[PDB]
Structure formats: structure tokens, C-alpha cells
């Protein structure tokens, strides 16, 4: 589950209403154009945090008409209402005005795909192609000049086909306000390719089909094949559904499908390859208003996310459902899942995913926001769960009592940790700590600390800085320092189980500490996961047993994709045992010295159902140091569930014993933890309301945590600890065949 964090840009007090927005294609720079109350135009550049980039401010006595970033360099072209064009170079801090050659409003502005050339077009129909140097200066006269005598509406370059010559990529299409489209060849000759019945609303090129897509203001779609010689042929012509008389925003998805925002409380879809149409609408169950209208639309191909901006100042989003093995592939509307809204100030007018970081920029009549995606923070320990609900809101469940609490924060939460006594939150600049005081949660402390991750044990807080972990009080006072070398790398994982802390680093090292004393003491010395297990690219997650005797680690691959291996390091033996889901093998390997030490393997588990699964989360029982659990996902035999939960008993005498395997509950989005007798899971807010029929007048806190008893504890949810320990020792000794110690444990 993900949340979107609203970095409003730090607009100058002299900057008027925003007018257009544009991302750099590769770097996290957003250009924003403003119109003052004096009708003067300006352009500024901003960082992903909404901070203004120094010295990037540009102004004129007249409005900004267009923006275009260079495909690779930190160079921005700006077009103006007078017919000025200006190129700003951020890297050199230089502005270059192009030769005054247009005499009217710059309606078109576009860099060539090579970035060697810039195209510019005006309201009178003058088109110019310019060659530019590495600084953004004009190399003499235009390469092409043409005069259509009519208002230029849109331009797109034709990318060369994937293959030695120095081709600048000068093939392009241009459209006119009369509804015509012209191709232009590598020699600069212009040829008409389309004639539409009205003004062109949007234009696209489908590379796989060599085909030009045209949409008009009367919502008429058309598709044309265009061979290289510029002699177009019509493939399709269709009148799309929707309300005429508004400027519809339009996006093309994956070279197969069209999406439109037309101001109708729905996005309209048209699959160009199927000839099939459908709609998506915002749902009041997610908090949208009835008849709330969408004005703009954009798609991120890397994430599979569609976004749209509303007249009430909300961003709606839909996620593309994966093509899972063993389901008939979802068709039309069923390919999409609606997400919870992001709320912003004023009517939204434009949105864009344009930078390679896959950040979303949002432009309202009032202001611009950058939306950064973050995972919802969550934690479980000591029968307490904490779950994030918004950038500044938590749901805290004390599962030993069944009570749930709503906990609003004066910060945008970047992480959470919970205990039987308290909850800690942090934003990467400050930490706040809240204490349970009866039936209410109250602030116990708040302090400045740039910690990426945090953990807690009793009154002690564990916090991270460059190459160190700092033990602190709830008021932030440093009690103790735990140190790392630059070669061991910075801490970026913390886990606490029983009286033990385990710590993991960027650079894939780890350490562990005994907490049972007035000061923390090193329990495991430093180890490198890359020395232990070759081919590991990093740490994806790290946890320890309640005895501190075993550390479990999820490795990551060098591309940060998840690995079918899980590693268990034995602190007393100084060794790793590795289980690989893709083979079912259990390894053992040693680090009693840094040499190429001896290794072993065994064939002790044979469940062929696991071969397609990959581990994604893991936990240890807070009381039983032998008991471990993992959540594993099928990498896209009975019926294949998408996710399996596996529980293991781990011992020095018998290695790894599979205790239970089961499919994750269909209402559960992830494994949150385990504490005997229960597994714990995160429930969706979309499903909590479907089963709870209740009386009017209670503000019901949604039960965002679900629990399942362990197999052998079904019907034993409350059984007595001393007798239960003797029965566990008995059953263990009986399964081992050691009936004498079994009989002794029962005495």
C-alpha cells in the first residue's frame, strides 16, 4: 500500500498564478511558468522537495506561451507571447535569446529526440527548425523555415526505427488550427498527411505500427499509417463519447490504448488494438465528492499508475492489476484498481509524471505541488500493531485489549515503531514519541534527529546517523553510541526481538547487541553478507530470534529485485544456513575465519509447490526463539495462491523444520508479524466496511489488522503457559524420539 506526500513548491511572493508545468525527462527538476497580475510572464525551476533551484528565475513583460526541456542536458527552452524564444542552461547559468524571427505568440516548441535541434512555431503559422550547440546557443540561421499562414497547434518528432550516419532525427508531424496535419522529411519538404473536420485536440505516434493518432475538439479519433515517404493512409476513424465544449486532456498508454479527461466525473478509455471502450469513475467510499470532475490525466509506464486531477482539488489514481498466472487476464475496467485520494488546494488544471524518478507534479489555479510516493509505514511488537492511514495519520491497535486508537501527527510520517507502552514516529528531520495513558495516547517527547529508521526497547530509543546507532531517552537525550566504519557502511535496518537488537547496513554488513544491561553490548561482531553468501547485491530485510542466537536476512539482487534465497546466520557457530525457494535446498557455510571455509547441503524438503515463490517479509516469535515465519509471493501442485505464509521451527540438531504452510487470507495485503498463538496481517481499508453492520452514532475506527491462530493453537487461544511449555518440550522430545526427556518434561 502507498501514500502520496504533497511537497507544495516554495513560490516567490512576486510569482502570480501558475500556468504550465514541465519535468526534465531524466533529472528530478520541475519547470513552472507563472502569469503575474501585471500580465508579465516568468519561469522557475524546482527540486523534488518543492524547493526553488538558485539562479533559475527568468522573466519577461509578456506571458509564457510554451516550455520544453532538452531530452538529456539541463537545458530548458521557453516560448513567449511576443514571439521571443529563450534557451536557459542550468549547468552553465546562461540564458540565450533566439534571433527575433517570429512576430507572434509561440504556440509550438519541441526538442528533437537527439537534442541537437529545437523546433519553434507561432500563431501566424511561421515554423522554424534551429541547430544548437552544447550550451544552448544557435548555430547560425534556421535549418528550416516554413510559413503555413495559419495558427500552429501541436508538433511531434518521428523517432528513427531501432537499428551509422549522424542523423539528428528531423522527421516530424505538425498540426494547424484548420484541422490539417503536415509531415516534414529529412530535406525539410512539407507534405499534408491528414484533414480533420475540426481543430486538433491531441496528436500521437505509435512506433510499432508506424501510425499517427489524431483526436479533434469534436472528440473524433483517427489513425493513419505513414510510410517514410510521407504518403499517409487511414486505418480507422471513430467518434468518441464525451461532452464537447471543454479542452479535453488526453494520454496514450503503452502504444495500444487512449485515455481522456473531459470534465464528466469519469475518465474515458478506448483500446486502439481491440476497438473496445470503458470508463473509470471516483467512488464516494474512498472520500471523493458526488459529481466531482476530472480535468487532466497522466500515466506512469514504469509503475503502471494512471493519475487524474479534479475540479475540487483532489488527485485520483488507478493501479494496473498484474497479469497473474492462473486467472483469465482482466479485461477493460477490471485491469484497474482505484486508490485513496490525495487532497490539494484549489481546482487542478494540469498533471505530469514526466521525470525518470516517476514523481507526479500537480498544477492548480492557486499553486503547484510535487507528489512523492512512499510505502505506508507499519509495525508490530509485544501484541501492539501500528498502521499508517495518511501522510500524517496512524491507526494503533493494542491486540492484547482489542482497543484501536487514531493518532494524528504534526509531521509527514516516514516511519513508525510500537511497544506495549509507546509509539514512535519520524519524518527524517525529527522524531516524536507517544505514551499510552489509559484509554488515550499522549505526546511523551519530540526532538530533532535525521534518522532514516528507528527501534525501541523499554525507555530506550535506537536512532541512526552517518556510520552510527545512538541509544536515546524518549526526550532524545543520547545515552550511548554504537559505531560502524565507512567500510561497514551506514545502518539502514534495525530490528528488536526479546532483549536483542540487530542492525544491518548499506554495504550489506550486520551486527547485534545484547540489551539486558544498563548499556547495550556487542553480541555479534561485524559480518559481511557478501563474504557469507556470494552473488548477494544487498540486504532487503533483517530480523533476529528472541534469544539473539539466529539472525534471518532477506538478500537483494544487484538490481534491487527480490532474491529467492533467504539467509540465516548463527551467532554462536559463526555460520550461515541458506534456504532457496527456487530449489528447496538448505545450505550451510562458515565464517569462524575469513578464509574459503567448508560448506554442506541437504535434501530435507521436497515441496515442489515452492519453486515459483520468492520471500518478501519475515519475522520471529517474541517468546519462542526456535519459531520463525516468512511471507513468499509467486514470481509472475494444488491451486497456486499468489502468496504463501510459511512457519518453521529452527534448531541446531535438526536444521529447518516446516511447521505450517498456508495461503495468505484473501482480505490480507501483507504479513505484519507473528506472536504465539497468532499470525498478524494488514487488512485493506477497502474491505473493512463490507462485513461490519453496526448501529448509528459510533465513529468506528477501521480494523486495519487481522489475526489467524497457528494450526496447533486452533482451540488453544488461551492455554496456560507453564503447562504449555512442558507440552511443547514433551511434543518436541516425542517427535525427536527422546521419550525419557519427554516423560521428564511432563512430571
Amino acid at each position: 500500500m502507498a501514500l502520496y506526500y504533497d511537497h507544495q513548491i516554495e513560490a516567490p511572493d512576486a510569482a502570480g498564478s501558475p500556468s504550465f508545468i514541465s519535468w526534465h525527462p531524466v533529472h528530478p527538476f520541475l519547470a513552472v511558468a507563472y502569469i503575474s497580475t501585471t500580465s508579465t510572464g516568468s519561469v522557475d525551476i524546482y527540486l523534488e522537495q518543492g524547493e526553488c533551484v538558485p539562479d533559475t528565475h527568468v522573466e519577461r513583460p509578456f506571458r509564457v506561451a510554451s516550455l520544453c526541456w532538452h531530452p538529456t542536458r539541463l537545458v530548458l527552452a521557453v516560448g513567449w507571447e511576443t514571439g521571443e524564444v529563450t534557451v536557459f542552461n542550468k549547468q552553465d547559468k546562461e540564458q540565450h535569446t533566439m534571433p527575433l524571427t517570429h512576430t507572434a505568440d509561440i504556440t509550438v516548441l519541441r526538442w528533437s529526440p537527439s537534442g541537437n535541434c529545437l523546433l519553434s512555431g507561432d500563431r501566424l503559422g511561421v515554423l522554424l527548425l534551429w541547430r544548437l550547440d552544447q550550451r544552448g546557443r544557435v548555430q547560425g540561421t534556421p535549418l528550416l523555415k516554413h510559413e503555413y499562414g495559419k495558427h500552429l497547434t501541436h508538433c511531434i518528432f518521428r523517432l528513427p526505427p531501432p537499428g551509422m550516419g549522424s542523423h539528428e532525427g528531423l522527421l516530424f508531424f505538425v498540426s494547424l488550427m484548420d484541422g490539417t496535419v503536415h509531415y516534414v522529411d529529412e530535406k525539410g519538404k512539407t507534405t499534408q498527411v491528414v484533414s480533420a473536420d475540426s481543430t486538433i485536440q491531441m496528436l500521437f505516434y505509435m512506433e510499432k505500427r508506424e501510425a499517427l493518432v489524431v483526436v479533434t475538439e469534436n472528440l473524433r479519433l483517427s489513425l493513419y499509417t505513414v510510410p517514410p515517404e510521407g504518403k499517409a493512409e487511414e486505418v480507422m476513424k471513430v467518434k468518441l463519447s464525451g461532452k464537447t465544449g471543454r479542452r479535453a486532456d488526453i494520454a496514450l498508454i503503452e502504444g495500444s490504448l487512449l485515455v481522456m479527461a473531459v470534465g464528466e466525473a469519469a475518465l474515458r478509455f478506448w483500446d486502439i488494438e481491440r476497438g473496445e471502450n470503458y470508463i473509470l469513475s471516483p467512488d464516494e467510499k474512498f472520500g471523493f465528492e458526488k459529481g466531482e470532475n476530472m480535468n487532466c490525466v497522466c500515466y506512469c509506464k514504469v509503475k503502471g499508475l494512471l493519475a487524474a486531477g479534479t475540479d475540487r482539488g483532489r488527485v485520483a489514481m488507478w493501479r494496473k492489476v498484474p497479469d497473474f498466472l492462473g486467472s483469465p487476464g482482466a479485461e477493460g475496467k477490471d485491469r484497474w484498481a482505484l486508490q485513496t485520494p490525495t487532497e490539494l488546494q484549489g481546482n487542478i488544471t494540469q498533471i505530469q509524471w514526466g521525470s525518470r524518478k516517476n514523481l507526479l507534479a500537480v498544477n492548480s489555479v492557486i499553486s503547484v505541488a510535487i507528489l512523492s510516493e512512499r510505502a505506508m509505514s507499519s509495525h508490530f511488537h509485544q501484541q501492539v500493531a501500528a498502521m499508517q492511514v495518511s501522510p500524517s495519520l496512524l491507526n494503533v491497535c493494542f491486540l492484547s485489549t482489542g482497543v484501536a486508537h487514531s493518532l494524528r501527527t504534526d509531521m509527514h510520517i516516514s516511519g513508525v515503531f510500537a511497544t506495549k507502552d509507546a509509539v514512535a514516529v519520524w519524518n527524517g528531520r525529527q522524531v516524536a514519541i507517544f505514551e499510552l495513558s489509559g484509554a488515550a495516547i499522549r505526546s511523551a517527547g519530540t526532538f530533532l534527529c535525521e534518522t532514516p529508521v528507528l527501534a525501541m526497547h523499554e525507555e530506550n530509543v535506537y536512532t541512526v546517523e552517518s556510520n552510527r546507532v545512538q541509544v536515546r531517552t524518549w526526550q532524545g537525550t543520547v545515552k550511548q553510541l554504537l559505531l560502524f566504519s565507512e567500510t561497514e557502511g551506514n545502518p539502514c535496518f534495525l530490528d528488536i526481538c526479546g532483549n536483542f537488537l540487530v542492525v544491518g547496513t548499506d554495504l550489506a554488513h550486520f551486527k547485534s547487541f545484547d540489551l539486558s544491561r544498563r548499556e547495550a553490548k556487542a553480541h555479534c561482531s561485524c559480518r559481511s553478507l557478501a563474504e557469507l553468501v556470494p552473488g548477494v547485491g544487498g540486504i532487503a530485510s533483517l530480523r533476529c530470534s528472541s534469544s539473539g542466537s539466529t539472525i534471518s536476512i532477506l538478500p537483494s539482487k544487484a538490481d534491487n529485485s527480490p532474491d529467492s534465497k533467504i539467509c540465516f546466520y548463527d551467532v554462536e557457530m559463526d555460520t550461515v544456513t541458506v534456504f532457496d525457494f527456487k530449489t528447496g535446498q538448505i545450505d550451510r557455510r562458515e565464517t569462524l575465519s575469513f578464509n574459503e571455509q567448508e560448506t554442506n547441503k541437504s535434501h530435507l524438503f521436497v515441496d515442489e509447490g515452492l519453486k515459483n515463490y520468492v520471500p518478501v517479509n519475515h519475522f520471529w516469535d517474541q517468546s519462542e526463539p526456535r519459531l520463525f515465519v516468512c511471507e513468499a509471493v509467486q514470481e509472475t501442485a494444488g491451486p497456486a495462491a499468489d502468496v504463501l505464509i510459511l512457519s518453521f521451527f529452527i534448531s541446531e540438531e535438526h536444521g529447518f523444520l516446516l511447521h505450517e504452510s498456508f495461503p495468505r487470507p484473501a482480505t490480507s495485503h501483507s504479513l505484519l508479524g507473528m506472536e504465539v498463538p497468532y499470525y498478524y496481517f494488514t487488512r485493506k481499508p477497502e474491505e473493512a466496511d463490507r462485513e461490519d453492520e453496526v448501529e448509528p452514532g459510533c465513529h468506528h475506527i477501521p480494523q486495519m489488522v487481522s489475526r489467524r491462530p497457528l494450526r496447533d493453537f486452533v482451540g488453544l487461544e488461551d492455554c496456560d503457559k507453564a503447562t504449555r511449555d512442558a507440552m511443547l518440550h514433551f511434543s518436541f522430545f516425542v517427535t525427536i524420539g527422546d521419550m525419557d526427556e519427554a516423560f521428564k518434561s511432563i512430571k
Side-chain angles (χ1 to χ4, degrees), residues 410-433:
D410 62 335
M411 77 179 78
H412 292 297
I413 299 149
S414 71
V416 67
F417 194 102
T419 77
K420 69 188 181 180
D421 298 322
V423 178
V425 311
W426 59 103
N427 72 349
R429 297 180 181 181
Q430 69 175 329
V431 178
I433 299 179

mmCIF file of all heavy atoms in Angstrom, residues 410-433:
data_model
loop_
_atom_site.group_PDB
_atom_site.id
_atom_site.type_symbol
_atom_site.label_atom_id
_atom_site.label_comp_id
_atom_site.label_asym_id
_atom_site.label_seq_id
_atom_site.Cartn_x
_atom_site.Cartn_y
_atom_site.Cartn_z
ATOM 1 N N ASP A 410 1.891 15.995 13.845
ATOM 2 C CA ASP A 410 2.305 17.322 13.357
ATOM 3 C C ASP A 410 3.462 17.256 12.333
ATOM 4 O O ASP A 410 4.140 18.252 12.073
ATOM 5 C CB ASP A 410 2.653 18.238 14.546
ATOM 6 C CG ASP A 410 3.831 17.761 15.406
ATOM 7 O OD1 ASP A 410 4.122 16.545 15.441
ATOM 8 O OD2 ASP A 410 4.439 18.609 16.098
ATOM 9 N N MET A 411 3.697 16.082 11.745
ATOM 10 C CA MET A 411 4.726 15.819 10.742
ATOM 11 C C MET A 411 4.216 14.818 9.701
ATOM 12 O O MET A 411 3.378 13.968 10.016
ATOM 13 C CB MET A 411 6.013 15.316 11.427
ATOM 14 C CG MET A 411 5.967 13.847 11.883
ATOM 15 S SD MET A 411 7.492 13.242 12.658
ATOM 16 C CE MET A 411 7.314 13.961 14.308
ATOM 17 N N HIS A 412 4.775 14.869 8.492
ATOM 18 C CA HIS A 412 4.617 13.819 7.483
ATOM 19 C C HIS A 412 5.446 12.586 7.866
ATOM 20 O O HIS A 412 6.669 12.586 7.760
ATOM 21 C CB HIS A 412 5.027 14.350 6.105
ATOM 22 C CG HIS A 412 4.113 15.402 5.531
ATOM 23 N ND1 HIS A 412 2.770 15.212 5.195
ATOM 24 C CD2 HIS A 412 4.486 16.661 5.158
ATOM 25 C CE1 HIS A 412 2.366 16.361 4.626
ATOM 26 N NE2 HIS A 412 3.373 17.249 4.600
ATOM 27 N N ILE A 413 4.789 11.526 8.326
ATOM 28 C CA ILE A 413 5.399 10.292 8.829
ATOM 29 C C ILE A 413 6.227 9.607 7.730
ATOM 30 O O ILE A 413 5.726 9.336 6.644
ATOM 31 C CB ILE A 413 4.281 9.350 9.339
ATOM 32 C CG1 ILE A 413 3.467 9.960 10.503
ATOM 33 C CG2 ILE A 413 4.841 7.985 9.779
ATOM 34 C CD1 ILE A 413 2.018 9.461 10.477
ATOM 35 N N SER A 414 7.484 9.275 8.019
ATOM 36 C CA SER A 414 8.370 8.459 7.166
ATOM 37 C C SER A 414 8.635 7.055 7.738
ATOM 38 O O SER A 414 9.190 6.201 7.047
ATOM 39 C CB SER A 414 9.689 9.206 6.935
ATOM 40 O OG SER A 414 10.473 9.235 8.112
ATOM 41 N N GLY A 415 8.239 6.810 8.990
ATOM 42 C CA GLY A 415 8.372 5.529 9.674
ATOM 43 C C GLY A 415 7.673 5.523 11.033
ATOM 44 O O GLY A 415 7.397 6.584 11.600
ATOM 45 N N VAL A 416 7.368 4.321 11.535
ATOM 46 C CA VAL A 416 6.737 4.085 12.843
ATOM 47 C C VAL A 416 7.329 2.846 13.531
ATOM 48 O O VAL A 416 7.697 1.879 12.865
ATOM 49 C CB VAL A 416 5.197 4.014 12.719
ATOM 50 C CG1 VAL A 416 4.691 2.790 11.942
ATOM 51 C CG2 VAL A 416 4.503 3.998 14.086
ATOM 52 N N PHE A 417 7.394 2.866 14.862
ATOM 53 C CA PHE A 417 7.728 1.721 15.719
ATOM 54 C C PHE A 417 6.799 1.731 16.943
ATOM 55 O O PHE A 417 6.456 2.802 17.440
ATOM 56 C CB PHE A 417 9.216 1.782 16.113
ATOM 57 C CG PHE A 417 9.786 0.508 16.718
ATOM 58 C CD1 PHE A 417 10.582 -0.353 15.934
ATOM 59 C CD2 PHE A 417 9.561 0.193 18.072
ATOM 60 C CE1 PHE A 417 11.160 -1.506 16.501
ATOM 61 C CE2 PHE A 417 10.104 -0.982 18.625
ATOM 62 C CZ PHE A 417 10.910 -1.826 17.845
ATOM 63 N N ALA A 418 6.380 0.568 17.438
ATOM 64 C CA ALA A 418 5.419 0.435 18.532
ATOM 65 C C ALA A 418 5.878 -0.568 19.605
ATOM 66 O O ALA A 418 6.599 -1.524 19.333
ATOM 67 C CB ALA A 418 4.050 0.064 17.942
ATOM 68 N N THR A 419 5.434 -0.352 20.839
ATOM 69 C CA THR A 419 5.667 -1.199 22.016
ATOM 70 C C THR A 419 4.397 -1.242 22.870
ATOM 71 O O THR A 419 3.470 -0.453 22.674
ATOM 72 C CB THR A 419 6.851 -0.711 22.877
ATOM 73 O OG1 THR A 419 6.499 0.407 23.659
ATOM 74 C CG2 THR A 419 8.110 -0.340 22.096
ATOM 75 N N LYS A 420 4.348 -2.138 23.862
ATOM 76 C CA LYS A 420 3.251 -2.209 24.845
ATOM 77 C C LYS A 420 2.988 -0.901 25.609
ATOM 78 O O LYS A 420 1.902 -0.732 26.158
ATOM 79 C CB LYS A 420 3.514 -3.375 25.811
ATOM 80 C CG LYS A 420 4.710 -3.140 26.753
ATOM 81 C CD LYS A 420 5.023 -4.417 27.544
ATOM 82 C CE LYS A 420 6.197 -4.177 28.499
ATOM 83 N NZ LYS A 420 6.526 -5.398 29.276
ATOM 84 N N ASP A 421 3.959 0.015 25.644
ATOM 85 C CA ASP A 421 3.898 1.281 26.384
ATOM 86 C C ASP A 421 3.783 2.523 25.481
ATOM 87 O O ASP A 421 3.206 3.526 25.905
ATOM 88 C CB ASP A 421 5.156 1.404 27.259
ATOM 89 C CG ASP A 421 5.297 0.311 28.325
ATOM 90 O OD1 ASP A 421 4.274 -0.095 28.918
ATOM 91 O OD2 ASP A 421 6.444 -0.091 28.616
ATOM 92 N N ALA A 422 4.337 2.492 24.264
ATOM 93 C CA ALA A 422 4.549 3.695 23.458
ATOM 94 C C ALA A 422 4.601 3.436 21.939
ATOM 95 O O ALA A 422 4.791 2.315 21.476
ATOM 96 C CB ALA A 422 5.846 4.373 23.939
ATOM 97 N N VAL A 423 4.461 4.510 21.159
ATOM 98 C CA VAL A 423 4.644 4.540 19.701
ATOM 99 C C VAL A 423 5.593 5.684 19.337
ATOM 100 O O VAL A 423 5.423 6.802 19.815
ATOM 101 C CB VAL A 423 3.289 4.681 18.975
ATOM 102 C CG1 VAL A 423 3.443 4.770 17.452
ATOM 103 C CG2 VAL A 423 2.372 3.492 19.268
ATOM 104 N N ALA A 424 6.575 5.422 18.480
ATOM 105 C CA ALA A 424 7.489 6.416 17.923
ATOM 106 C C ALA A 424 7.223 6.637 16.434
ATOM 107 O O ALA A 424 6.987 5.681 15.699
ATOM 108 C CB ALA A 424 8.934 5.967 18.149
ATOM 109 N N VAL A 425 7.322 7.887 15.988
ATOM 110 C CA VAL A 425 7.192 8.303 14.587
ATOM 111 C C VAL A 425 8.347 9.230 14.226
ATOM 112 O O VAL A 425 8.877 9.937 15.081
ATOM 113 C CB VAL A 425 5.840 8.991 14.293
ATOM 114 C CG1 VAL A 425 4.651 8.181 14.818
ATOM 115 C CG2 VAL A 425 5.750 10.402 14.881
ATOM 116 N N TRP A 426 8.730 9.267 12.957
ATOM 117 C CA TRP A 426 9.775 10.181 12.481
ATOM 118 C C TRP A 426 9.544 10.584 11.035
ATOM 119 O O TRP A 426 8.942 9.824 10.282
ATOM 120 C CB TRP A 426 11.154 9.529 12.645
ATOM 121 C CG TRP A 426 11.395 8.231 11.928
ATOM 122 C CD1 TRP A 426 12.099 8.063 10.785
ATOM 123 C CD2 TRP A 426 11.000 6.888 12.344
ATOM 124 N NE1 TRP A 426 12.152 6.721 10.459
ATOM 125 C CE2 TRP A 426 11.502 5.948 11.395
ATOM 126 C CE3 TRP A 426 10.289 6.361 13.445
ATOM 127 C CZ2 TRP A 426 11.289 4.566 11.515
ATOM 128 C CZ3 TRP A 426 10.059 4.980 13.571
ATOM 129 C CH2 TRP A 426 10.556 4.080 12.610
ATOM 130 N N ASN A 427 10.050 11.743 10.610
ATOM 131 C CA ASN A 427 9.931 12.249 9.229
ATOM 132 C C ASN A 427 11.277 12.391 8.482
ATOM 133 O O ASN A 427 11.326 12.974 7.400
ATOM 134 C CB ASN A 427 9.120 13.557 9.232
ATOM 135 C CG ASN A 427 9.859 14.740 9.806
ATOM 136 O OD1 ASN A 427 10.911 14.608 10.408
ATOM 137 N ND2 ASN A 427 9.364 15.936 9.615
ATOM 138 N N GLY A 428 12.380 11.912 9.067
ATOM 139 C CA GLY A 428 13.734 12.103 8.532
ATOM 140 C C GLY A 428 14.395 13.441 8.909
ATOM 141 O O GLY A 428 15.545 13.666 8.537
ATOM 142 N N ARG A 429 13.706 14.314 9.665
ATOM 143 C CA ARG A 429 14.237 15.564 10.261
ATOM 144 C C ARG A 429 14.029 15.625 11.784
ATOM 145 O O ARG A 429 14.877 16.141 12.509
ATOM 146 C CB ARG A 429 13.619 16.795 9.565
ATOM 147 C CG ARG A 429 13.975 16.887 8.071
ATOM 148 C CD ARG A 429 13.345 18.120 7.412
ATOM 149 N NE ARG A 429 13.673 18.186 5.975
ATOM 150 C CZ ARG A 429 13.305 19.128 5.123
ATOM 151 N NH1 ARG A 429 12.571 20.139 5.483
ATOM 152 N NH2 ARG A 429 13.680 19.071 3.881
ATOM 153 N N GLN A 430 12.928 15.063 12.281
ATOM 154 C CA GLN A 430 12.556 14.978 13.692
ATOM 155 C C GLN A 430 11.912 13.626 14.032
ATOM 156 O O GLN A 430 11.389 12.924 13.163
ATOM 157 C CB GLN A 430 11.645 16.161 14.071
ATOM 158 C CG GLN A 430 10.243 16.136 13.440
ATOM 159 C CD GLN A 430 9.348 17.263 13.949
ATOM 160 O OE1 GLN A 430 9.443 17.732 15.073
ATOM 161 N NE2 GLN A 430 8.442 17.750 13.132
ATOM 162 N N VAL A 431 11.927 13.295 15.322
ATOM 163 C CA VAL A 431 11.288 12.126 15.934
ATOM 164 C C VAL A 431 10.279 12.619 16.977
ATOM 165 O O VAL A 431 10.580 13.540 17.736
ATOM 166 C CB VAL A 431 12.343 11.218 16.599
ATOM 167 C CG1 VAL A 431 11.722 10.002 17.295
ATOM 168 C CG2 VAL A 431 13.409 10.702 15.622
ATOM 169 N N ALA A 432 9.105 11.994 17.055
ATOM 170 C CA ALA A 432 8.135 12.190 18.130
ATOM 171 C C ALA A 432 7.739 10.847 18.752
ATOM 172 O O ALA A 432 7.640 9.834 18.061
ATOM 173 C CB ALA A 432 6.921 12.963 17.617
ATOM 174 N N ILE A 433 7.521 10.838 20.068
ATOM 175 C CA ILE A 433 7.227 9.638 20.853
ATOM 176 C C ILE A 433 5.962 9.882 21.665
ATOM 177 O O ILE A 433 5.818 10.912 22.322
ATOM 178 C CB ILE A 433 8.440 9.232 21.723
ATOM 179 C CG1 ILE A 433 9.631 8.927 20.787
ATOM 180 C CG2 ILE A 433 8.099 8.020 22.603
ATOM 181 C CD1 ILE A 433 10.936 8.531 21.449
#
